[PDB]
């Protein structure tokens, strides 16, 4: 805890030539100074994607433990913060994709993942596996899809995983394909490029995942779904 | 359309590619470095270590080790202490 | 009379200058290293979002760091005791003279108040004649270009 | 302020010039403002009704976006120009019932459907759910 | 200041430290010194 | 279980006990490639053992690509002779196998989602980063890459016993998550 | 550049030659031969003969020629 | 003091041999011969880059390779130089590359 | 075609050496003589220290020594190899195949090891 000297008022406060004789001194500890900078970076990343403050608070707590544990001392602080931010989103039940975290961070996706693994090891903690429904609300909302389409996409992805029609596929790829299937079955139709941009998945990956679930399209769709485009006439590709 | 998910930033892959393409500086033989080191001294009487590395294009540790044997550090209060390429 | 518009514009000029200042600083580090810079990562959205919010949230006018010279009382919690009270709070006028300072002349009912300011509505106590309310039809020019 | 001052301030800002060799120029062209929006913890945006902000202690602010043109001179007699359309630069609190307010242009019946008093004159800001009025 | 004396730092360095010590000590008693900077609470609020 | 993992790659390091001139080796060695800017070692390949070895100026050499313990030692000795044939006093000192890589298939799909839940302490499944589950066995220090297709890759073993022992431990676990 | 760099190689070659045990003095031209400085400029030769080889504290002028200074150094 | 690649070729060998004949006759000092070779390398290197605008393709099997000081010494066996206009067959070829 | 390219090379070579021949003070007649000659010429082992236990583990070393076969000299833009094959992005260069000289600008080559 410290006090900062205020600005000079009278002539006595100023040296013989202009500059104030009493100047603030950097007395902050190096460990605290780096930690302070990390929290500033954490807040900056969160605002880019409008993360709630509670997630930021969890992220700040995670970094302090990681920073104190010093298992990741060799890695850049920004990467740790970016990885810590990713873990906080998972811990709070609103996971963000590594690409989404990278979009708001100068650190690349690969480094974030590497730090993410180390932080879990250092903290002796675990994160629940991501499901296709963990991204439907954000992906559909960003695509400006109605609630009915979002519900259909959520049901399609959940049913497809349960039916094991996309074994080994990344949950994001399955969700993007499910959104595309639901989007093409409603008035609001979105292209693969459109869904890929928000979902962060290449249109080719959406095409592959969609092709796997297309054969059983009627089964995956909700029973009480109003098909603007009939399931039979859904795109085949 | 802002902060779209991306695996790696475009500015970052270009920098990574340039670093990979350029490659790490190699440790050349002492004689060649010495010959190039003294040729540089001809152009300018005084050289900065950071700028001197670019001319030699040698690892900093290797350059310092060779420069330490013959080169000496002269303390200048105006800016900072720099290296002297004159053996004496 | 400085209204929210001129008031907010003054704040935005500083925040935007700060926004560009950090944008220049962030870009300077990356360009110095020889690598291109991501424009999105250079922008700190907290500068404008929080700066505007803090000034309105607390009423301290200016910067939180420079609260010493910041004008206080500019922003107040809207009074919901009565609809007339709510209306009056939205038509209130604050005199430049500090409330602590005492001077009759600024507190006096000047002749120029006719038709512009209510001659009767004014608080009793240290704020007599300093806090005022607009006349019923009185309007404040929003300003325009003289070109 | 929103319609003119914000654009004027952004336009009046000198272009940012970087030189440290490649030279980078940044110019802010246009200002875009959206409806007062709230983001759920999952990241889904949604319009923020004034009543919701009061109850949930939110700040009635509209996302702010700006068009930025990035031109780089690499000393090779080649100029590359790229524009980052609608670059988010922060959020501006919105005076209620103003031209950019959600309640703007809503009939008395519409305001009732939004749990908003038609007689309410607006003219104030909701910061963290607190109705704030800027005193002249 | 004690470390600088033990470390034998430069006289001007010690003089600056003495200046700060005099300021802090003086403002520990009276923070309303005329024509002198005020001691803020890291948030712009002068110390009491 | 009836399934024995088959080694795919073995990494063995042997010290030649003498400093070597990397530039000279590259000029005279048949298949050596030396790029000091890229890497500080000399990379050489011999087709018949089908292995690749890296040679450092310190005299220590690393041999990789061998499919068996005998092949690794034989390949390492052949590399040492090549250096010895170049006029250096290369020897075969403290030869050791540093890593053994084995692969096998369980012949049935695996529900990785269930496996991580029951073995979160050892499992690490991140579809975003890698499509295969990473299992870190403790009793043997072996890292296993389990995939939905059933393919299992074992690595980090110092002896062939660990590779077989590790698979024997994980196989019953995989059988409990058969898809 | 020119006029200031060839001298360093002469000194370094001189130092290395002394380490071999060759205490005998060496002429300016002779030292230039082994340092690949046969193209050394004329005005550089006189400068070395007048300033560099006398001002330096490690150069001894013996019978006209120049030799190392191990006596000053502790051996 | 240059790249010095085409010296060990038919064009390079002829130039080197010619300089030797003049040297034996004392017509040219040895220093001049080195300068002539140096200038030729600059001209040939620039000549190939600018006045050559034809693409070629080839396939084969590699028997040996080397690398040192950014110089490759590939050794290909049974190479099939295939071009749009003609196809050329060779039992063995050595490809030396530099940069 | 190739002979025409060779003739152009001669013009560049003679022109590029004119300045040098003036610097050293040698008579210009040398260049004329050089061209004439140049044209004519063209047209259980527990104790493992001993490595002698293995022999004939190499191949003939005269492949590089002879160099009488066709030799190709060029420049490389990219050279990639993936565990079996070597890929060559060789740029402008020269080739000596069966005496005949071949010239190319872009070369693509895949080889098997």
UniProtKB/Swiss-Prot annotation, chain A:
Region called Necessary for TATA box-bound TBP complex formation, residue ranges: 165-237
Q: Name one GO biological process term.
A: RNA polymerase II preinitiation complex assembly
**Mind naming one GO cellular-component term on file for this protein?**
protein-DNA complex
Q: What is its main location?
A: nucleus
Q: According to the UniProt record, what happens if one changes residue 53 to Q?
A: In a colorectal cancer sample; somatic mutation
Q: How is it modified after translation?
A: Acetylated. Autoacetylated; autoacetylation at Lys-159 stimulates transcription activation.
Intracellular or extracellular location(s): Nucleus; Chromosome
Gene Ontology terms, MF aspect = acetyltransferase activity; DNA-binding transcription factor binding; histone acetyltransferase activity; nuclear thyroid hormone receptor binding; promoter-specific chromatin binding; RNA polymerase II complex binding; RNA polymerase II core promoter sequence-specific DNA binding; RNA polymerase II general transcription initiation factor activity
Which positions carry Phosphoserine?
13
| Region Core promoter DNA-binding, annotated ranges | 110-114, 170-173, 204-207
Expression sites (tissue/organ): Expressed in the inner cell mass forming the embryoblast. Not detected in cells from the outer thin layer trophoblast (at protein level).
Broad EC category:
transferase
Please list the residues that carry the modification N6-acetyllysine. Answer: 159
Keywords for this protein? Acetylation, Acyltransferase, Chromosome, DNA-binding, Host-virus interaction, Metal-binding, Nucleus, Phosphoprotein, Repeat, Transcription, Transcription regulation, Transferase, Zinc, Zinc-finger
What effect is documented for mutating residue 168 to V?
Inhibits interaction with TBP
Q: What is its EC number?
A: 2.3.1.48
Q: Which family does it belong to?
A: Belongs to the TFIIB family.
Q: What is this protein called?
A: Transcription initiation factor IIB
- Source organism: Homo sapiens (Human)
Q: What is the lineage of its organism?
A: Eukaryota, Metazoa, Chordata, Craniata, Vertebrata
Report where the shown chain sits in the full-length sequence: first residue, last residue, total length: 80 to 316 of 316
Swiss-Prot record, chain B:
Q: Which UniProt keywords apply?
A: Acetylation, DNA-binding, Nucleus, Phosphoprotein, Transcription, Transcription regulation
Protein name listed in UniProt:
General transcription factor IIF subunit 2
- As recorded in Swiss-Prot or TrEMBL, the protein's gene is named GTF2F2
Under the GO molecular function aspect, what terms does this record hold? DNA binding; RNA polymerase II general transcription initiation factor activity
Q: What is the scientific name of the source organism? A: Homo sapiens
Tell whether DNA-binding is among the UniProt keywords.
Answer: yes
- UniProt keyword Cell membrane, yes or no: no
Per the UniProt entry, what are the Gene Ontology biological process annotations, in alphabetical order? positive regulation of transcription by RNA polymerase II; transcription by RNA polymerase II; transcription elongation by RNA polymerase II; transcription initiation at RNA polymerase II promoter
Which stretch of the intact protein is present?
151 to 238 of 249
| CC per GO annotation | microtubule cytoskeleton; nucleoplasm; nucleus; transcription factor TFIIF complex
Which residue spans adopt a coiled-coil conformation according to this UniProt entry? Answer: none
Protein family (similarity comment): Belongs to the TFIIF beta subunit family.
Role noted for this protein: TFIIF is a general transcription initiation factor that binds to RNA polymerase II and helps to recruit it to the initiation complex in collaboration with TFIIB.
The main location is nucleus
Q: How does it assemble?
A: Heterodimer of an alpha and a beta subunit. Interacts with HTATSF1 and GPBP1. Interacts with URI1. Interacts with GTF2B (via N-terminus); this interaction is inhibited in presence of GTF2F1.
Curated annotation (Swiss-Prot), chain F:
Alphabetical keyword list: Disease variant, DNA-binding, Host-virus interaction, Neurodegeneration, Nucleus, Repeat, Spinocerebellar ataxia, Transcription, Transcription regulation
Recorded disease: Spinocerebellar ataxia 17: Spinocerebellar ataxia is a clinically and genetically heterogeneous group of cerebellar disorders. Patients show progressive incoordination of gait and often poor coordination of hands, speech and eye movements, due to degeneration of the cerebellum with variable involvement of the brainstem and spinal cord. SCA17 is an autosomal dominant cerebellar ataxia (ADCA) characterized by widespread cerebral and cerebellar atrophy, dementia and extrapyramidal signs. The molecular defect in SCA17 is the expansion of a CAG repeat in the coding region of TBP.
Please verify whether the record's keywords include Nuclease: no
Membership in a protein family: Belongs to the TBP family.
Tell me which GO cellular component terms the UniProt record holds. Answer: chromatin; cytosol; euchromatin; female germ cell nucleus; female pronucleus; male germ cell nucleus; male pronucleus; nucleoplasm
Where does this polypeptide localize?
Nucleus
Query: Its GO biological process terms?
Result: DNA-templated transcription initiation; mRNA transcription by RNA polymerase II; positive regulation of transcription initiation by RNA polymerase II; RNA polymerase II preinitiation complex assembly; spermatogenesis; transcription by RNA polymerase II; transcription by RNA polymerase III; transcription initiation at RNA polymerase II promoter
Q: Which gene encodes it?
A: TBP
Q: Repeat among the record's keywords?
A: yes
UniProtKB/Swiss-Prot annotation, chain H:
Q: Does the keyword Glycoprotein apply?
A: no
Top-level division of the source organism's lineage:
Eukaryota
- This chain's source organism reads Homo sapiens (Human)
Q: Which InterPro entries match?
A: TFIIA_a-hlx, TFIIA_b-brl, TFIIA_gsu, TFIIA_gsu_C, TFIIA_gsu_N
Q: Does the keyword Transcription apply?
A: yes
Q: Among the entry's GO cellular component annotations, what is one?
A: transcription factor TFIIA complex
Write out the similarity annotation: Belongs to the TFIIA subunit 2 family.
Quaternary structure annotation from Swiss-Prot or TrEMBL: TFIIA is a heterodimer of the large unprocessed subunit 1 and a small subunit gamma. It was originally believed to be a heterotrimer of an alpha (p35), a beta (p19) and a gamma subunit (p12). Interacts with NCOA6 general coactivator. TFIIA forms a complex with TBP. Interacts with HSF1 (via transactivation domain). (Microbial infection) Interacts with SV40 Large T antigen.
UniProt function note: TFIIA is a component of the transcription machinery of RNA polymerase II and plays an important role in transcriptional activation. TFIIA in a complex with TBP mediates transcriptional activity.
Q: Which UniProt keywords apply?
A: Host-virus interaction, Nucleus, Transcription, Transcription regulation
- One Pfam annotation reads TFIIA_gamma_N
The UniProt entry, under SUPFAM superfamilies, shows: Transcription factor IIA (TFIIA), alpha-helical domain, Transcription factor IIA (TFIIA), beta-barrel domain
The Gene Ontology terms for molecular function here are: protein heterodimerization activity; protein homodimerization activity; RNA polymerase II general transcription initiation factor activity; RNA polymerase II general transcription initiation factor binding; RNA polymerase II-specific DNA-binding transcription factor binding; TBP-class protein binding
Q: Can you say where in the cell this protein is located?
A: Nucleus
């Amino acid at each position: 805890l410290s006090t900062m000297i205020g600005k000079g008022t009278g002539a006595a406060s100023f040296d013989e030539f202009g500059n104030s004789k009493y100047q603030n001194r950097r007395t902050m500890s190096s460990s605290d100074r780096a930690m302070m900078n990390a929290f500033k970076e954490i807040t900056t990343m969160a605002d880019r994607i409008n993360l709630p403050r509670n997630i930021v608070d969890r992220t700040n707590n995670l970094f302090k433990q990681v920073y104190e544990q010093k298992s990741l001392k060799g890695r850049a602080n920004d990467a740790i913060a970016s990885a810590c931010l990713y873990i906080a989103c998972r811990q709070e039940g609103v996971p963000r994709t590594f690409k989404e975290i990278c979009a708001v961070s100068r650190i690349s996706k690969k480094e974030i993942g590497r730090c993410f693994k180390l932080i879990l090891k250092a903290l002796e903690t675990s994160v629940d596996l991501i499901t296709t429904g963990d991204f439907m609300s954000r992906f559909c909302s960003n695509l400006c899809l109605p609630k009915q389409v979002q519900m259909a996409a959520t049901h399609i992805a959940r049913k497809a995983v349960e039916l094991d029609l996309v074994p080994g596929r990344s949950p994001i790829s399955v969700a993007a394909a499910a959104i595309y299937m639901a989007s093409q079955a409603s008035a609001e139709k979105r292209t693969q490029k459109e869904i890929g941009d928000i979902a962060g998945v290449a249109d080719v990956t959406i095409r592959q995942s969609y092709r796997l679930i297309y054969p059983r399209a009627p089964d995956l769709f909700p029973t009480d779904f109003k098909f603007d485009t009939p399931v039979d006439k859904l795109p085949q590709l | 359309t802002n902060y779209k998910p991306v695996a790696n930033h475009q500015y970052n892959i270009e920098y990574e590619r340039k670093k990979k393409e350029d490659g790490k500086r190699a440790r050349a033989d002492k004689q060649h470095v010495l010959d190039m080191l003294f040729s540089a001294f001809e152009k300018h009487q005084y050289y900065n270590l950071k700028d001197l590395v670019d001319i030699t294009k040698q690892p900093v540790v290797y350059l310092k080790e060779i420069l330490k044997e013959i080169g000496v550090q002269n303390v200048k209060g105006i800016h900072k202490n720099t290296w002297e390429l004159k053996p004496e | 009379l400085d209204l929210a518009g001129p008031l907010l514009a003054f704040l935005f000029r500083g925040m935007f200058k700060n926004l560009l200042k950090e944008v220049r600083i962030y870009a300077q580090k990356f360009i110095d290293r020889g690598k291109d810079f991501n424009l999105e990562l250079a922008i700190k959205t907290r500068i404008i979002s929080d700066g505007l919010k803090y000034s309105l949230a607390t009423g301290n006018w200016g910067d939180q760091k420079k609260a010493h010279q910041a004008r206080a009382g500019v922003s107040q919690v809207l009074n919901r005791l009565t609809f007339a009270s709510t209306l009056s709070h939205l038509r209130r006028l604050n005199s430049p003279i500090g409330r602590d300072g005492k001077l009759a002349k600024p507190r006096q009912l000047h002749n120029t108040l006719w038709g512009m300011v209510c001659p009767a509505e004014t608080p009793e106590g240290h704020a007599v004649g300093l806090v005022k309310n607009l006349a019923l039809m009185a309007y404040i020019s929003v300003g325009s270009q003289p070109s | 302020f929103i319609q003119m001052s914000v654009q004027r301030i952004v336009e009046d800002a000198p272009p940012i010039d970087l030189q440290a060799p490649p030279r980078y120029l940044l110019k802010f062209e246009q200002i875009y403002l959206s409806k007062p929006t709230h983001w759920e913890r999952d990241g889904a945006p949604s319009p923020m009704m004034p009543n919701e902000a009061r109850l949930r202690n939110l700040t009635y602010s509209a996302p702010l976006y700006v068009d930025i043109t990035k031109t780089v001179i690499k000393e090779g007699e080649e100029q590359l120009q790229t524009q980052h359309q609608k670059t988010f630069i922060g959020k501006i609190p919105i005076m209620l019932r103003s031209t950019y307010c959600l309640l703007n242009g809503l009939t008395d019946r519409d305001l009732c459907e939004l749990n908003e008093c038609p007689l309410d004159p607006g003219g104030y800001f909701i910061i963290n759910g607190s109705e704030k009025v800027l005193i002249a | 200041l004690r470390r600088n004396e033990q470390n034998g730092a430069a006289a001007h360095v010690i003089a600056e430290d003495v200046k700060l010590l005099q300021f802090h000590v003086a403002t520990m008693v009276d923070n309303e010194l005329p024509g002198l900077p005020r001691a803020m609470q890291k948030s712009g609020r002068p110390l009491k | 279980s009836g399934i024995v993992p088959q080694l795919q790659n073995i990494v063995s390091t042997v010290n030649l006990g003498c400093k070597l001139d990397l530039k000279t080796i590259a000029l005279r060695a048949r298949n050596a490639e030396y790029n000091p800017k890229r890497f500080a070692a000399v990379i050489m390949r011999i087709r018949e053992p089908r292995t690749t070895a890296l040679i450092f100026s310190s005299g220590k050499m690393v041999c990789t690509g061998a499919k068996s313990e005998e092949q690794s030692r034989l390949a390492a000795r052949k590399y040492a002779r090549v250096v010895q044939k170049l006029g250096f006093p290369a020897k075969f000192l403290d030869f050791k196998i540093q890593n053994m890589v084995g692969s096998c298939d369980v012949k049935f799909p695996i529900r990785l989602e269930g496996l991580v839940l029951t073995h979160q302490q050892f499992s690490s499944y991140e579809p975003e980063l890698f499509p295969g589950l990473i299992y870190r066995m403790i009793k043997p220090r072996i890292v296993l890459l389990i995939f939905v297709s059933g393919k299992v890759v074992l690595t980090g073993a110092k002896v062939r016993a660990e590779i077989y022992e590790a698979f024997e431990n994980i196989y019953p676990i995989l059988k409990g998550f058969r898809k | 550049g020119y006029k200031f760099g060839v001298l360093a190689k002469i000194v370094n070659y001189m130092k290395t030659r002394h380490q071999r045990g060759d205490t005998h003095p060496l002429t300016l031209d002779e030292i230039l031969d082994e340092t690949q400085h046969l193209d050394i400029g004329l005005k550089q030769k006189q400068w070395l003969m007048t300033e560099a080889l006398v001002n330096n504290p490690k150069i001894e002028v013996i019978d006209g020629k120049y030799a190392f200074k191990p006596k000053y150094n502790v051996r | 003091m240059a790249y010095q690649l085409y010296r060990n070729t038919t064009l390079g060998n002829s130039l080197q041999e010619s300089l030797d004949e003049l040297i034996q006759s004392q017509q040219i000092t040895p220093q001049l011969a080195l300068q002539v070779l140096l200038q030729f390398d600059k001209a040939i290197n620039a000549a190939l880059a600018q006045r050559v605008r034809n693409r070629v393709n080839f396939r084969g099997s590699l028997n040996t390779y080397r690398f040192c000081d950014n110089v490759w010494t590939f050794v290909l066996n049974d190479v099939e130089f295939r071009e749009v206009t003609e196809l050329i067959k060779v039992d063995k070829v050595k490809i030396v590359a530099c940069d | 075609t190739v002979p025409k390219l060779y003739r152009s090379v001669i013009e560049d070579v003679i022109n590029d050496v004119r300045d040098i021949f003036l610097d050293d003070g040698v008579d210009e007649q040398v260049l004329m003589e050089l061209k004439t000659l140049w044209e004519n010429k063209l047209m259980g082992q527990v104790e493992e220290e001993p490595l002698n236990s293995e022999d004939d583990v190499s191949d003939e070393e005269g492949q590089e020594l002879f160099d009488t076969e066709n030799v190709v000299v060029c420049q490389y833009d990219k050279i990639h190899r993936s565990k079996n094959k070597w890929k060559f992005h060789l740029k402008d260069g020269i080739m000596n195949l069966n005496g005949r000289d071949y010239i190319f600008s872009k070369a693509i080559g895949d080889a098997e090891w």
